[PDB]
Amino acid sequence: SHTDVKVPDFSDYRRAEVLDSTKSSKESSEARKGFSYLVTATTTVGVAY
Amino acid sequence: TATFAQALQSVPETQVSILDNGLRVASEQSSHATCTVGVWIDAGSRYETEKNNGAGYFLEHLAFKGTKNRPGNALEKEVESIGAHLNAYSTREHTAYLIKALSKDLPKVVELLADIVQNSSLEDSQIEKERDVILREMQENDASMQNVVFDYLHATAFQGTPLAQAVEGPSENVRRLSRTDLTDYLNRHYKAPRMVLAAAGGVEHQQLLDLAQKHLSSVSRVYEEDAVPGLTPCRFTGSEIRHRDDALPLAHVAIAVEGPGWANPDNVTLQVANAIIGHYDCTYGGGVHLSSPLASVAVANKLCQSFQTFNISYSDTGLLGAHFVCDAMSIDDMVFFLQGQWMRLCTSATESEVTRGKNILRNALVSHLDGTTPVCEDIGRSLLTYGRRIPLAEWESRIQEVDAQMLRDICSKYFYDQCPAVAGYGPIEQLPDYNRIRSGMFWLRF
Amino acid sequence: MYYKFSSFTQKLAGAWASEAYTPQGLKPVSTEAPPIIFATPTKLTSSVTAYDYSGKN
Amino acid sequence: MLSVAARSGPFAPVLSATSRGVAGALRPLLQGAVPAASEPPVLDVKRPFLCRESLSGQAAARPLVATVGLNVPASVRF
Amino acid sequence: MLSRFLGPRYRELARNWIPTAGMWGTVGAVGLVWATDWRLILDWVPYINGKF
Amino acid sequence: QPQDLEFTKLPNGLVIASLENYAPLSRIGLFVKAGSRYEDSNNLGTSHLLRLASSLTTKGASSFKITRGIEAVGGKLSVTATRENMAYTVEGIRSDIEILMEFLLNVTTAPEFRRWEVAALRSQLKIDKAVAFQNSQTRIIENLHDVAYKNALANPLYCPDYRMGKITSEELHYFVQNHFTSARMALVGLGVSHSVLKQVAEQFLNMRGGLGLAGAKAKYRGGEIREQNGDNLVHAAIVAESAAIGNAEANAFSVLQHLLGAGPHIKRGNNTTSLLSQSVAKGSHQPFDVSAFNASYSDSGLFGIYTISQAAAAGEVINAAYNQVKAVAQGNLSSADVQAAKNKLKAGYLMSVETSEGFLSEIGSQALAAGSYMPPSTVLQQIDSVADADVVKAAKKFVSGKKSMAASGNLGHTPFLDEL
């Protein structure tokens, strides 16, 4: 059936803030995209300089 | 004469009473000669531990195949003795057994429901027969691509949690399914404080309360281990599942974000957002003059076969998004247009669209609650989710609080710059990469 | 015949007699449930022990 | 019991066809979609028979015999 | 011939788009000040008073 | 308690009925005796395109105005069609009923029927016929009506493929000016007072006055049709002629179909009380379903059996069902099963008039056929006044009459009508 189709574990790839399947997301999600857009922002500052 | 708010005020109130067991007995009375009486149980597929995944569905199968008091099809004959309709469903969070009947047979039907509550005989030959029937209807439900996409979206949106597993479970669980685990599931998930006996139509609340005190007294009241089963939260995962099978003629794609839940009131505002976008399929007769911009664009450019928008809510979680079936050669373009509409609701929601969505939501909320059966369903799910039956006047008061500013604030809260869950099935080569979709979930012009 | 719990709305909608009350097909037997093959299955493990406080003794 | 469509129990939406010009607030069950099917081939038009002399000989009188050639066009006789 | 663009919906659209356009004008002004080293502005910013 | 249903027979023949429900949403519908019964062979499929032309340009309201006006208030406009009558129903909030009735009556009285709009609409009717023929019951009931009647009811609900691209605006205007006449209109309203409906009907619908073009008089021919399409299941419908609507024999045939099996009562039920299901289940071991079909129109009816079975076991299923009906016709029935069938019929009618849209359909149908409303208690008393000898006589009329058989599937083992 299509109910046999199961996603395997990604625990060897996930971030530390979303490793737990019991706690909810959307609490640390803004911190994660803040870190990623901070990396993007400082790269864009460097290339603009 | 009467206005809309006065007419909603004139709707009768749902009477709710309690038992010593913890049963919630609720009833809404109208002037109909028929009635719908059902039992709603807070036990879905979310309460299973991955080794009893098909347990509630298999109980729903064996629930109508005889009891200890009424062995076998004679039970069915009883439901056909009075001309009653016996229906049931199982969800990821709820289970319901409901009977439509007349009012004059209102005692015995309650007793019949009580039988299916607490005396369900599980014969082993019936286990093998219903195992074959479950395998047959899972291979039948594989043909319907919409349910496959729904299950794929739930599997990829809540990975590693008890909300990813399907209602019916995997096939191997159906093969090795014993009777002891069904008895354990019935013992630990069919207790009295997780049950609502709901009646709608030509009923009396005192007579129904007396019948529940007679038949539905002492259902379980005991956890049998002094271990209350609870529900941990389920982690939403922005991810993507793509089932590529080019032999199918059409492709189904669903894109969702994480929803707020049941008790969070902005649900109502999010309903208005869906009412702005709406639904469309090829059998409609509006042409290019449809009010929804997505529907008008899809008609004009011949993009999609059909689309719909959903706001599915579970206990402090949910999915919120769109699902469309279309040919391969349009898929990417449809995604683009859909994302544009979402960002429009995040940036430039106007007052006329908000008023139209509010009118559509009022029409949907009242037009759903016609007849005894959806009213009984509303009562049971309201006492199970909110803990109370929310009146339609309170829905009207909640709709009237919505203007364009809080609508675009809520849409910026939930839709804007968020990781979606994408489920695809069919010729989905032109379905864009997840980086493209995540880029399309925000605007550079804001 | 009257209502089926569907249409992505968590509600009962209008359905036919052959779709709401006979959801199984009229095929004689179920055909097959084919397995899924993969490169290499990943490892699944949990971590919730954490630690405790520190002090004297 | 009038209302023939409602009098027939299971065959209620088979004996009556319902469509809409303006979509409702409630989403319909079984939205449905036309799959991309095949198309018939395009053939040149044939001679009409609007006089009695051209209809002379057009009526069948023999068992029908098909013939497929390799480099001969496929023919049929009545 | 722009009398089509007179109405309450277009007024609400423009009113929604004032702060984003103002912020983009602020970005363009700061970018033109920084890339040209204008003495009318950097002499007022307290940190950048070293090259002039 | 809401007010009683109240009627008014206008001098132009229009029948208006209103019930003040004090409902939050009002539903208002016009019922017209203008089905596919009234098409001859030169205007086939006109009723299908007229059904799909409910949002075209009218006088005073264009297509854009109609769609954007009904869609802004949240209400809906829909149209349903049997083979005998159509119904244009709008529904919406009671503060919007004035513009909703304006839109409904402008749609249903004076459509402009422009050429380019129906030229756009013909592809839509092709798509509609494809979606409607995606299932299997619709095609076999359509062929059953094709073979059961020789005229005036063999005209299908959906436009034939040869007529697509051939319906013009002139024959749509001709059909409207013949069959949308005021002597065959029932304007019914739930949630609206009689004053508003009466004043709108007197102010706007004095355009046509005549009785209209009628005189169909459908006749029975019988026979069979076979559709070899290679499905693993075989669908079969074997019917015969039966009495019309509005008679005691129609109630006898309804009691007979609820005795023989008239649809499921239990989700994934075993159909214990259905006699045909009992006979096939004692005869077979395969998945199947056998039900009883009854379609009783104003002048004639069709009653019979409908089986879906396997390709290799269609003959035993059809023979078992026919032998069960033959056993019922000989007098092999008990009074408890007749009482159960009567209770099933009463509950089925009362559940059919449960919701507001089914109730309004019942109001419009009884207002068209009789000009008044029978209360449901009188209908239940008419159900209760049927003897089992009338059921035996109805089964004997079905058995001893000429038949119409429509079959679809792999019909290698499917018996012909001479072998039943």
Curated annotation (Swiss-Prot), chain A:
Signal sequence bounds: none
Transmembrane segments: 33-49
Mitochondrial matrix topology ranges: 1-32
Domain of life (superkingdom): Eukaryota
Record note on quaternary structure: Component of the ubiquinol-cytochrome c oxidoreductase (cytochrome b-c1 complex, complex III, CIII), a multisubunit enzyme composed of 11 subunits. The complex is composed of 3 respiratory subunits cytochrome b, cytochrome c1 and Rieske protein UQCRFS1, 2 core protein subunits UQCRC1/QCR1 and UQCRC2/QCR2, and 6 low-molecular weight protein subunits UQCRH/QCR6, UQCRB/QCR7, UQCRQ/QCR8, UQCR10/QCR9, UQCR11/QCR10 and subunit 9, the cleavage product of Rieske protein UQCRFS1.
Function: Component of the ubiquinol-cytochrome c oxidoreductase, a multisubunit transmembrane complex that is part of the mitochondrial electron transport chain which drives oxidative phosphorylation.
Listed name of the protein: Cytochrome b-c1 complex subunit Rieske, mitochondrial
Species the sequence originates in: Mus musculus (Mouse)
The gene coding this protein: Uqcrfs1
Residues represented out of the complete protein: 79 to 127 of 274
From Swiss-Prot, chain B:
InterPro entries xrefs: Metalloenz_LuxS/M16 (IPR011249), MPP/UQCRC_Complex (IPR050361), Pept_M16_N (IPR011765), Peptidase_M16_C (IPR007863)
Name of a matching Pfam family: Peptidase_M16_C
Transmembrane segments: none
Tissue: Expressed in neurons and astrocytes of the cerebral cortex and hippocampus (at protein level).
Chief localization: mitochondrion
Subcellular location: Mitochondrion inner membrane
Membrane protein topology class: Peripheral membrane protein
Residues that bear N6-succinyllysine: 129
Residues modified as Phosphoserine: 178
Disruption phenotype: Results in early embryonic lethality.
Gene3D superfamilies: Metalloenzyme, LuxS/M16 peptidase-like
GO CC annotation: mitochondrial inner membrane; mitochondrion; myelin sheath; respiratory chain complex III
PTM field: Acetylation of Lys-104 is observed in liver mitochondria from fasted mice but not from fed mice.
Keywords: Acetylation, Electron transport, Membrane, Mitochondrion, Mitochondrion inner membrane, Phosphoprotein, Respiratory chain, Transit peptide, Transport
A GO BP entry: mitochondrial respiratory chain complex III assembly
GO MF term set: metal ion binding; protein-containing complex binding; ubiquitin protein ligase binding
Modified residues (N6-acetyllysine): 77, 104, 129, 214
Family stated for the protein in its record: Belongs to the peptidase M16 family. UQCRC1/QCR1 subfamily.
Function description: Component of the ubiquinol-cytochrome c oxidoreductase, a multisubunit transmembrane complex that is part of the mitochondrial electron transport chain which drives oxidative phosphorylation.
UniProt-recorded name of the protein: Cytochrome b-c1 complex subunit 1, mitochondrial
Originating organism: Mus musculus
From Swiss-Prot, chain C:
Record localization: Mitochondrion inner membrane
Expression induction or repression: Specifically induced in muscle upon exercise. Expression is induced by ATF4 downstream of the EIF2AK3/PERK-mediated unfolded protein response, thereby increasing formation of respiratory chain supercomplexes.
Membrane topology recorded in Swiss-Prot or TrEMBL: Single-pass membrane protein
Pathway of action: Energy metabolism; oxidative phosphorylation
Recorded GO CC terms: mitochondrial inner membrane; mitochondrion; respiratory chain complex; respiratory chain complex IV
Disruption phenotype: Knockout homozygous mice manifest decreased mitochondrial respiratory activities and impaired formation of mitochondrial supercomplexes in muscles. Mice display muscle weakness and exhibit heat production failure in the cold.
One biological process term in Gene Ontology: regulation of oxidative phosphorylation
Alphabetic keyword roster: Acetylation, Membrane, Mitochondrion, Mitochondrion inner membrane, Transit peptide, Transmembrane, Transmembrane helix
Residue span of the annotated presequence: 1-54
Family: Belongs to the cytochrome c oxidase VIIa family.
Subunit and partners: Interacts with the mitochondrial respiratory complexes III (CIII) and IV (CIV), promoting their association.
Protein name: Cytochrome c oxidase subunit 7A2-like, mitochondrial
Gene, per the UniProt record: Cox7a2l
UniProtKB/Swiss-Prot annotation, chain F:
GO MF annotations, alphabetized: metal ion binding; metalloendopeptidase activity; protein-containing complex binding
Membrane-spanning ranges: none
Record-linked SUPFAM superfamilies: LuxS/MPP-like metallohydrolase
Keyword rRNA processing: no
GO CC, alphabetical: mitochondrial inner membrane; mitochondrion; myelin sheath; nucleoplasm; respiratory chain complex III
Membrane topology: Peripheral membrane protein
Annotated positions of the Phosphoserine modification: 335
Expression sites (tissue/organ): Expressed in neurons and astrocytes of the cerebral cortex and hippocampus (at protein level).
Modification note: Acetylation of Lys-126 and Lys-217 is observed in liver mitochondria from fasted mice but not from fed mice.
Residues the record lists as N6-acetyllysine modifications: 33, 166, 217
Alphabetical GO biological process terms: cellular respiration; mitochondrial electron transport, ubiquinol to cytochrome c; proteolysis; response to xenobiotic stimulus
Places the protein is found: Mitochondrion inner membrane
Keywords associated with the record: Acetylation, Electron transport, Membrane, Mitochondrion, Mitochondrion inner membrane, Phosphoprotein, Respiratory chain, Transit peptide, Transport
Listed PANTHER family: CYTOCHROME B-C1 COMPLEX SUBUNIT 2, MITOCHONDRIAL, METALLOPROTEASE
Membership in a protein family: Belongs to the peptidase M16 family. UQCRC2/QCR2 subfamily.
Functional description taken from the UniProt entry: Component of the ubiquinol-cytochrome c oxidoreductase, a multisubunit transmembrane complex that is part of the mitochondrial electron transport chain which drives oxidative phosphorylation.
Official protein name in the record: Cytochrome b-c1 complex subunit 2, mitochondrial
Organism: Mus musculus (Mouse)
